[PDB]
Amino acid sequence: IQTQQLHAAMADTFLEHMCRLDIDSAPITARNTGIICTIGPASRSVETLKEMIKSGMNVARMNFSHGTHEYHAETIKNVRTATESFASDPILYRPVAVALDTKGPEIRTGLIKGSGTAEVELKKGATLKITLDNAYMEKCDENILWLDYKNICKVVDVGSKVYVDDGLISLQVKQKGPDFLVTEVENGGFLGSKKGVNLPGAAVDLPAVSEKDIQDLKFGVEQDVDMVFASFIRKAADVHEVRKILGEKGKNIKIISKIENHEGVRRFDEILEASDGIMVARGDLGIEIPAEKVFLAQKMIIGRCNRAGKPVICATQMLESMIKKPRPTRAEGSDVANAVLDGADCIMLSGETAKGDYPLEAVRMQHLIAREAEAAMFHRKLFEELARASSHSTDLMEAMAMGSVEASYKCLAAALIVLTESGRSAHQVARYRPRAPIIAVTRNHQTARQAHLYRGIFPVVCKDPVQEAWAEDVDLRVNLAMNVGKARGFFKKGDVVIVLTGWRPGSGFTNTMRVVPVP
Amino acid sequence: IQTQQLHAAMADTFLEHMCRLDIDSAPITARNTGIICTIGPASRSVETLKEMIKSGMNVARMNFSHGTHEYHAETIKNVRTATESFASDPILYRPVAVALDTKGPEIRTGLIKGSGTAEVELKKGATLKITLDNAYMEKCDENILWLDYKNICKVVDVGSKVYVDDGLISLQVKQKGPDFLVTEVENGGFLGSKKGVNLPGAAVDLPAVSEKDIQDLKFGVEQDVDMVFASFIRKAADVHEVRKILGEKGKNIKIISKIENHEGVRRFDEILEASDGIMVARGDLGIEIPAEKVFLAQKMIIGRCNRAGKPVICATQMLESMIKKPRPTRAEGSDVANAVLDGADCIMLSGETAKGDYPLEAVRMQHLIAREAEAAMFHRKLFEELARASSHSTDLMEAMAMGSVEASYKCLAAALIVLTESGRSAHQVARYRPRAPIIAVTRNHQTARQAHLYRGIFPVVCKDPVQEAWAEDVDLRVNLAMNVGKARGFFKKGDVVIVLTGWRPGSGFTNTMRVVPVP
Amino acid sequence: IQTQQLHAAMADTFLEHMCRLDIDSAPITARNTGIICTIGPASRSVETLKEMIKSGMNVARMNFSHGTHEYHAETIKNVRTATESFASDPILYRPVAVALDTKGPEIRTGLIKGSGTAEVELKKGATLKITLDNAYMEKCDENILWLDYKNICKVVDVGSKVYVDDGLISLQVKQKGPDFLVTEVENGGFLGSKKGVNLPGAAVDLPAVSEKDIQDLKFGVEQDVDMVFASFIRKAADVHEVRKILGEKGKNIKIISKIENHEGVRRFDEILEASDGIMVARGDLGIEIPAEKVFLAQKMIIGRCNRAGKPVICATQMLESMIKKPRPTRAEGSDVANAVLDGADCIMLSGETAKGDYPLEAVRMQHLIAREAEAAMFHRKLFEELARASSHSTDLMEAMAMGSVEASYKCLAAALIVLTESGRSAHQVARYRPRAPIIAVTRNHQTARQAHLYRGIFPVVCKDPVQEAWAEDVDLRVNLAMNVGKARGFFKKGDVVIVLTGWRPGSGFTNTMRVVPVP
Ligand SMILES: [K+]
Ligand SMILES: [K+]
Ligand SMILES: [K+]
Ligand SMILES: [Mn+2]
Ligand SMILES: [Mn+2]
Ligand SMILES: [Mn+2]
């Protein structure tokens, strides 16, 4: 029984490829899919965080939908402390990106009575009066419910449905009002405090970038975050408004547009070009459009991102049950596998690691499945189709990338070492899905950090000062990579490896490729 | 925006196909994936069952892992009552298969103290003594645990792991014994009563067909079940032992081997040939082998079954969360979609409909997703690869099937009407995955019933007596199908439809195909 | 209107590719298909030869089926004189290979009366007596015909057919004899002197390597020919007998087995492995087997050679009519195009350049068509299928080759510069059919010369002494290539180019590849 599902790799057709998957075919050590973990109570701890890093964490997500700047400021402080605790050995140090998740134009209810279980009980068929009067802002009963969206009455006529708390509870507007709405509970349940509200099929006129959002964004720039996950991007315009706030200083912060509404899906393409990467926000998306259609959008978005060479993230409830159990459900297990198979650059945990009882177990599980799923990819067809997809381009780096991935498949290289400062060279190699890991060695820390956004890139930060002789500085970097790999168990002395470097210091792209043995 | 994801159907590549999926492309009314619902407390009711049928139920699963013959006898009685309640109109009557799920060579614990919450609490690190003494059979403490597997000590040495309750709780044998084992709780939790036990990597010497199993099987034959889902089939031999018990009388009961252990996966092929269909028992499978590998086995088994033309079922925890909530999680939604996309003939609910609070909602959800996912298939490539896969065969019915599916894709037929008595003709048409529904009209009830096992076949039972003139009897049957379709909303007058019939009464296969308009 | 038929290159299917061919899409300057010209009266002249070289000649074929060693000795002398006349400028000097074509186990008639038009007239239905008596060796009438095959009577029974002069004339053995045969003229015609004779379906017992052949072979070694086109190779054994005569000295002379009989086709594979390259000797082949089947053998042999990475030649009557006219027939035009499209490494002229009235025009015509046809190839599918074909191999140079060709397609490189001494590296790159020209720079002259055998390789001989510093010696060679290309009009300053070099002097293969701009 070969390994890395290679027997299936040799398949002519998909059905064949599929038929040849072997549960006894061991995957390699490198896990190419990036793992984004949302930090919170269950993971705030520096010690916990250190354990997260060791378990596979690559990006720490700060969800500004809750918490105060003071809060996140410390969260970020801890992840950095945790990260740098390994900063010792440059060979074992693993960069960890910091991402700020916008609390975009979203609707939420107020606080519940308090002594009513902090959770009322809407009965299937009961009447519920929605109010905009800030008085009941923190006193929500089974009859009174306050929400922060003031113009709610300016866009919802009688009959329309208003969902609350991850669409689990639905309400039908029975009667309109000036600053209130009386509705009928359709889906019963126990309403929580300050839960999310969805107005599917409704021109919600909240601003792409709210006032709070501008503050949060500025905050992120000052706190040097590596990327922004912009919530509810519904058009290229929104992305631009966001990029603007980040301004000249936040200039290098990668913007990841989140697709969570029907318009965003409908106007995906312009949003894609305007953005640096995309996130399939399955959560709100599953409420704004029929749940049974979310998979369509996912595969379409991942597909189109893969084609465009832009990072894409699959997010929300992937390992949901693990918030309370140490093992995920069969559906959750397959969900992760398929996202990787779909082509997602990164998978995410949020809740499973933010406030669940098994943050570490959840991270480990994603790491395990990804590896397993990655080997299961149909690399040959993938590469071929990816190639046809971009045939109109004749970019030199692209050519280098494709030539390298090709070569790597052919001699089954142990890895591809790419020396890059902007990261472009490595991104490009990742675009064409090699099977082996891509060790990108850079002296730029933010590059190393943002690199996680790309499938297969395993960043390494060279901390040695530039050597006088270019040739030497290159060997220096290449050797660092050779060690990281040997240490990380990616390959041992003797294995073959592809190496991409520049021609002169500060080259435009890695124009040089060579097959080399591991020292 | 076309429908049935047809724009994507026109794709040249997968990435393209993927990129073209449209959430606004409406699927057709017919849902080709069979839905198997496990019956229990939450669904025992004849009235509930009638509602299940209307919601999409196609096969009622009786799980003999629990309950008494008296119990199941009544369950079966009710589903039949519920079914026949529609027996009135032959146009609206929907056949419903009865399946018996074996309680194979499985290990279970005994009953818990009772006043201890009927659930003890094993603490992470605590010591737990496993006992075989039938005295504690119904008195299991946090220190005493009884299990029904007597030879457990004859196959588990010190150090080995023993999982309990869907592998959520793990234990490590610290010390051996004659009829007992002292272990250390690794994964804490609240042990329930009579929970399943897994000895991954352990030659469990329980018999393929136990003594109780022989009784249950005989019972099923006398109760005229349509199929048997044989648990823990680990080799072709086991299937044969099973087929034997069913004997001459149970001769036509389709045997569905369940793959739940590592050996069954490893010896899949012989098991496949020996069996009529297969079930991917994700539950035990996810405990016997690493969870992160279950997807590999699923796709491999579905792939190989599709190739072999034998029915395959995807089962366990697909819509798990719906046991308590009215809406499934994003992962569960995608899990179902992917199983359909994987090629599974049938999807299953067990727990979601056996004892959960939303049996109907769960059935409806599967029905919705399947439709959605079915349109999303890459039919062209699928058909092509399926064809290459079986090119060595030159079977006449196969040729007819392929010719028909081909024709159907080309003129976008509304459906394929197949007159069959054994069902072979329709099975064969289903083998080559047409996009449209396959209306199989038969006078044989058990055929109609078992037909659900196949993707796309929508059985119709002709209850009119055989007509004197073959030509007439054919039009009779064809017209019935034409009505069912018109009634069920599959097509209206004018639409095109492919019709496969025999040449003489009692033909070997439907050798005649013709494009006809809907009257 | 793009160029190089690139719009068609982008095609998904063949029908598409085909449909997109554009007569207004200009091909590039480099002509990848090697052109082999048979030298004779019409081309013996050093001045004519110089003109041949300028017109495209790459290999000069010496046909030992006629002429004396003294003759060929001078022919070879002249081609060399002609070649070296350009030896001046190493940038414009074009290597020209010398090939010796064996006069294998072939049958020929004697001389005709003389005053009978040096051509008798066999009438359809007349009787003709074949004789082995050396007396009529130079006195052949319409009744008497002598042939050099002594054992002709030991393998041809009454009824069998004996063809004469390119099968244009057929005869049926009416009666047997001891040293004679009386036959009936079936196909009338004007018999010439010393014409070829074919005994299709007859165990002709002539030796693979005749006595004269051993002399001719030894002669070729002493005259340092680059390759031997071995006539009538009917099995691997024959090739070996040939390689043996060439012995230790002729050790590096490439042996090209000629497939001209039914056995050679039937035992092709062993012949292929035993040989260095193959020649589709359409001439005799079209007489030994039905003419209407020759195309089958051609495509099969070219196909299998392409797959094996061994040079294949398409030969005989490609531009036949041009022996007397300045323009070829429509069929001849397409014949050449298709041979190139078939995948033939080299096309040949023999007669068109040996004794026709338009040697130069014929060479120019092949050159024109090849270019045109080369652009018309379906490179993408070709590369993909070529890759699948050899997937079992994991050769490092192969990987480099494939990676490079891939890269070259992607950025539409102007050419691939390969520094090689044995030629292996360049051969390998040619194996995977890049679209651009392959400039192989070598210091080995015989390598440069034999390189023509491979599609796309444009040899360049570095005549500068090895430089002290490897790095320098490499740039030296690379720069030479850069100049040849600029001079030859293959590319100008700025264009992109792929460069393959070794890692240390005398490397095993070019393990280094880099995209570089033309200085
Ligand atoms: K948020
Ligand atoms: K069972
Ligand atoms: K010859
Ligand atoms: Mn959101
Ligand atoms: Mn089971
Ligand atoms: Mn010949």
Cβ of A187 and B321 within 8 Å?
A: no
Q: What residues in C contact A494, CB-CB < 8 Å?
A: none
H or E element that contains C163:
strand C161-164
- Return the partners of chain C (3 or more C-beta pairs < 8 Å): A
With vertex at residue A217, the alpha carbon angle to CA A214 and CA A222, rounded to the nearest 5 degrees, is 125
Give the pair of three-digit tokens for residue A344.
Answer: 């997602």
Three-state DSSP class for residue A330? helix
- Specify the residue for token string 């893969």: A306
Give the pair of three-digit tokens for residue C150.
Answer: 């002594």
Which of A61, A235, A310, A455 is the catalytic position? A61
Give the separation between CA B411 and CA B151, rounded to whole angstroms.
Answer: 62
Integer CA distances (angstroms), C383 to B96, C345, C428, in order: 53, 15, 13
B338 marked among binding-site residues: no
Identify residue B144 by its one-letter amino acid code.
I
Q: What residues in A contact C384, CB-CB < 8 Å?
A: 384
- Specify the residue for token string 């040899």: C459
In chain B, which residue's Cα lies nearest the Cα of A301? B19
**Binding site: residue ranges of A?**
58, 61, 63-66, 94, 101-102, 108, 195, 258, 260, 283-284, 316, 420-425, 452, 470, 477, 504-509
Clarify whether C108 is annotated catalytic: yes
Which of C243, C258, C267, C431 is the catalytic position? C258
With vertex at residue C76, the alpha carbon angle to CA C73 and CA C78, rounded to the nearest 5 degrees, is 110
Q: What residues in C contact A398, CB-CB < 8 Å?
A: 410-411
Give the separation between CA B74 and CA B41, rounded to whole angstroms.
Answer: 12
In chain C, which residue's Cα lies nearest the Cα of A513? C513
Chain A residues whose C-beta is within 8 A of a chain C C-beta are 10, 12, 384, 387-388, 391-396, 398-400, 402-404, 406-407, 410-412, 496, 503, 509, 511-516
Adjacent-strand bridge partners of A312:
A278
Give the separation between CA A146 and CA A134, rounded to whole angstroms.
Answer: 7
What's the per-residue H, E or C state across C387-431?
Answer: HHHHCCCCCHHHHHHHHHHHHHHHHCCCCEEEECCCCHHHHHHHH
From the list A305, A256, A255, A304, the residue with the least C-alpha distance to A281 is A256
**How many CA atoms within 13 Å lie on the side-chain side of B297?**
35
Give the separation between CA B451 and CA B464, rounded to whole angstroms.
Answer: 20
In this complex, which of A166, A297, A303 lies closest to B23 when CB atoms are compared? Answer: A297
Give the pair of three-digit tokens for residue C111.
Answer: 């001389």
Give the separation between CA B383 and CA A264, rounded to whole angstroms.
Answer: 34
Rg (CA), chain C: 24
Give the separation between CA A288 and CA A7, rounded to whole angstroms.
Answer: 42
* Beta carbons within 8 Å of A424's beta carbon, 6+ residues apart: A397, A509
Q: What residues in A contact B381, CB-CB < 8 Å?
A: 14
* B383 contacts B71 by C-beta, under 8 angstroms: no
Helices and strands (DSSP H and E) totals, chain A: 17, 20
Considering every ligand atom shown, identify the ligand nearest to the alpha carbon of residue B38 and give its number: 2
In chain A, which residue's Cα lies nearest the Cα of B316? A330
From the list C286, C358, C267, the residue with the least C-alpha distance to C319 is C358
Which of B235, B254, B258, B435 is the catalytic position? B258
In this complex, which of B307, B319, B338 lies closest to A19 when CB atoms are compared? Answer: B307
- Return the partners of chain B (3 or more C-beta pairs < 8 Å): A
C-alpha C213 to ligand 6 mean position (Å):
14
In chain C, which residue's Cα lies nearest the Cα of A471? C471
Give the count of Cβ contacts less than 8 A between chain A and C: 87
Neighbours of A297 (CB within 10 A): 23
* B460 contacts B476 by C-beta, under 8 angstroms: no
Clarify whether B442 is annotated catalytic: no
Give the separation between CA C405 and CA C415, rounded to whole angstroms.
Answer: 10
Give the pair of three-digit tokens for residue A438.
Answer: 């891509």
Give the separation between CA B70 and CA B368, rounded to whole angstroms.
Answer: 35
Give the pair of three-digit tokens for residue B301.
Answer: 């088994």
C-alpha B261 to ligand 5 mean position (Å):
9
With vertex at residue C318, the alpha carbon angle to CA C312 and CA C320, rounded to the nearest 5 degrees, is 145
Give the separation between CA B440 and CA B347, rounded to whole angstroms.
Answer: 20
The string of DSSP codes covering B212-260 is HHHHHHHHHHHTT-SEEEETT--SHHHHHHHHHHHTTTGGGPEEEEEE-
Identify residue C227 by its one-letter amino acid code.
M
Give the pair of three-digit tokens for residue A215.
Answer: 């503050």
- Specify the residue for token string 């092929």: B269
C-alpha C216 to ligand 3 mean position (Å):
11
Shortest Cα distance, chain A CAs vs residue C170, angstroms: 49
User: Could you give phi then psi for residue A283, rounded to 5 degrees?
Assistant: -55, -75
Provide the pairing of β-strand C59-63 with C196-198.
unpaired
Identify residue A118 by its one-letter amino acid code.
A
* C267 contacts C236 by C-beta, under 8 angstroms: yes
Give the separation between CA C284 and CA B480, rounded to whole angstroms.
Answer: 68
User: Could you give phi then psi for residue C255, rounded to 5 degrees?
Assistant: -100, 120
C-alpha C258 to ligand 3 mean position (Å):
10
Beta strands in A7-71 (DSSP E): 34-38, 59-63
Cβ of A333 and B15 within 8 Å?
A: no
Instruction: Report the structure determination method.
Output: X-ray
Clarify whether C61 is annotated catalytic: yes
Residues with CB under 5 A from ligand 1 (ion): A 65, 101, 103, 231
Provide the pairing of β-strand A346-349 with A312-315.
parallel
Integer CA distances (angstroms), A176 to A108, A173, C171, in order: 19, 7, 106
Provide the pairing of β-strand A496-501 with A512-517.
antiparallel
* Beta carbons within 8 Å of C194's beta carbon, 6+ residues apart: C108, C109, C110, C111
Phi-psi region of A161 (alpha: psi -120 to 50; beta: other; left: phi over 0): beta
Beta strands in A407-476 (DSSP E): 416-419, 438-442, 460-461
* C457 contacts C440 by C-beta, under 8 angstroms: yes
Task: Delineate the domains of chain B, giving CATH numbers in brackets.
Answer: 1-30+374-519 (3.40.1380.20), 31-104+208-373 (3.20.20.60), 105-207 (2.40.33.10)
Resolution of this model in Å is 3.0
C-alpha B283 to ligand 5 mean position (Å):
6
Considering every ligand atom shown, identify the ligand nearest to the alpha carbon of residue B286 and give its number: 5
Spatial strand order in the sheet of A144-146? A107-108, A196-198, A161-164, A169-175, A180-185, A127-131, A144-146
Phi-psi region of A69 (alpha: psi -120 to 50; beta: other; left: phi over 0): alpha
Phi-psi region of A232 (alpha: psi -120 to 50; beta: other; left: phi over 0): left
| Dihedral over Cα of B506, B507, B511, B512: its sign | negative
Provide the pairing of β-strand A196-198 with A161-164.
antiparallel
Give the pair of three-digit tokens for residue B154.
Answer: 């004859």
Adjacent-strand bridge partners of C99:
C61, C227
* C123 contacts C86 by C-beta, under 8 angstroms: no
| Dihedral over Cα of C488, C493, C495, C501: its sign | positive
C-alpha C305 to ligand 3 mean position (Å):
22
What is the distance between the terminal CA atoms of chain A, rounded to a whole angstrom? 28
Three-state DSSP class for residue B397? helix
From the list C503, C506, C512, C501, the residue with the least C-alpha distance to C418 is C501
* C489 contacts A486 by C-beta, under 8 angstroms: no
Give the separation between CA A25 and CA A21, rounded to whole angstroms.
Answer: 8
CA torsion C154-C158-C159-C160 (nearest 10°) is 10
The string of DSSP codes covering B36-57 is EEE-SGGG-SHHHHHHHHHHT-
Beta strands in A109-203 (DSSP E): 127-131, 144-146, 161-164, 169-175, 180-185, 196-198
Clarify whether A316 is annotated catalytic: yes
- Say how far residue C251 (Cα) sits from the centre of its chain: 20
Which of C31, C50, C80, C108 is the catalytic position? C108
Give the separation between CA A47 and CA A80, rounded to whole angstroms.
Answer: 12
* A229 contacts A100 by C-beta, under 8 angstroms: yes
